[PDB]
């Protein structure tokens, strides 16, 4: 068949799925890619609002977590572990005795 | 139920930078499956988060909770 | 009256709705209209990444036609995803 | 200031799956630059987040908020 | 024995994390001067650990991208592919690449 919705599919989409100007949310948007160093009816999906839920691996269905997602989870765990340090930093204490000056500038 | 290959082809062509680019027939079939896996993954993960909270349905809150880990997997 | 891109997006949204209805039936859990639209917006964006990546991967191998190795490379981050896509590739090839 | 080529090379070799893998000297120098942009992008996003919250300095809570999108952009 | 291999792997990891951390702290002090805001020590630790882990991601991708082009030696084309999610990132890196050529 066709790439576009048939008349019947279009009717279904219009009455079941399409968001409308009178719905409480009339549009869902995704944050756009922006590199900083180089809306009443509009819901922007957040990747940060639920940050406190992210220090544990969440359920999967058919797609296993990736290595970068495991790193993300581990970093969130590290941040949680340091959140209530004032001043003197445990990470510094764990690594700074291994520093070799020849490695750096 | 799934994405028609006719649609997926146009979806891929919409974003190509170069008019020379083509998609093999087997690659297109695979991209049909991959898009479905993505949709189903998002949907089932939202379902699990709803079940864990004993929610009546998957609302945007529940999807957003699973989102960073979903997008990092893909 | 709909632009080309609105028609693609609508087609995407409807297929997303249908797949969500299947999931809802199978796992006994409904989705809000907002969630289905959210998944559609994610899927449309994901397809942009996929397409751009596929074009650049093919070109990186000196090809203008995207092939099933470009797709596998798309799936590289998840062992189960790569396996699934690799299996399907063999299937198609048979 | 920035990373030394030698350090970048050790970081990458630590993670290659295959011992045959090598890195060209041009690639290495370009990785030095990419790494720097990564770190500076992380720090600048953190500053922008702290400003959005009228905070006086960048604490880890602000970094947490820009992490997912940072991982997705690289 | 295996215990020795493990202690050495650990100590070599911490060396590389220390060097990343030093460098990250220098770069963040420059951003701090420029943007007139400071970072907690914890934020610098977090960015260092992110950068360390991100090297693993870059490294694995470079190797796969090289292999996709039938190469076992990674080149600057492989590196530019790491920047592909942003047109402006890709532009900035491609320039550095060309500057590095001349
Ligand atoms: Zn994940």
Tab-separated table of N, CA and C and ligand atoms in Angstrom, chain A residues 58 60 63-66 69-70 73, chain B residues 45 68-73, ligand 1:
chain	number	residue	atom	x	y	z
A	58	UNK	N	17.154	0.711	35.066
A	58	UNK	CA	15.723	0.471	34.903
A	58	UNK	C	15.435	-0.763	34.074
A	60	UNK	N	14.335	-3.446	31.218
A	60	UNK	CA	14.391	-3.407	29.781
A	60	UNK	C	13.426	-4.450	29.271
A	63	UNK	N	15.848	-4.754	24.549
A	63	UNK	CA	17.018	-4.016	24.257
A	63	UNK	C	17.722	-3.813	25.602
A	64	UNK	N	18.864	-4.485	25.750
A	64	UNK	CA	19.726	-4.402	26.924
A	64	UNK	C	20.254	-2.978	27.072
A	65	UNK	N	20.616	-2.576	28.280
A	65	UNK	CA	21.310	-1.350	28.451
A	65	UNK	C	22.676	-1.391	27.741
A	66	UNK	N	23.068	-0.255	27.186
A	66	UNK	CA	24.340	-0.064	26.512
A	66	UNK	C	25.410	0.246	27.525
A	69	UNK	N	25.005	3.857	28.721
A	69	UNK	CA	23.911	3.951	29.685
A	69	UNK	C	24.385	3.412	31.059
A	70	UNK	N	25.164	2.323	31.073
A	70	UNK	CA	25.789	1.904	32.319
A	70	UNK	C	26.717	2.930	32.918
A	73	UNK	N	24.538	5.577	34.521
A	73	UNK	CA	24.020	5.102	35.806
A	73	UNK	C	25.129	5.193	36.873
B	45	UNK	N	8.807	-0.232	28.319
B	45	UNK	CA	9.476	0.377	29.491
B	45	UNK	C	8.563	1.353	30.244
B	68	UNK	N	15.943	8.836	29.745
B	68	UNK	CA	17.412	8.909	29.640
B	68	UNK	C	18.022	7.534	29.385
B	69	UNK	N	17.626	6.530	30.161
B	69	UNK	CA	18.153	5.188	29.899
B	69	UNK	C	17.712	4.551	28.557
B	70	UNK	N	16.540	4.878	28.042
B	70	UNK	CA	16.161	4.406	26.723
B	70	UNK	C	17.002	5.017	25.596
B	71	UNK	N	17.147	6.326	25.602
B	71	UNK	CA	17.841	7.028	24.541
B	71	UNK	C	19.359	6.686	24.560
B	72	UNK	N	19.906	6.501	25.739
B	72	UNK	CA	21.307	6.073	25.857
B	72	UNK	C	21.552	4.669	25.331
B	73	UNK	N	20.545	3.802	25.322
B	73	UNK	CA	20.652	2.450	24.728
B	73	UNK	C	20.640	2.405	23.235
F	1	LIG	ZN1	19.831	2.093	29.050
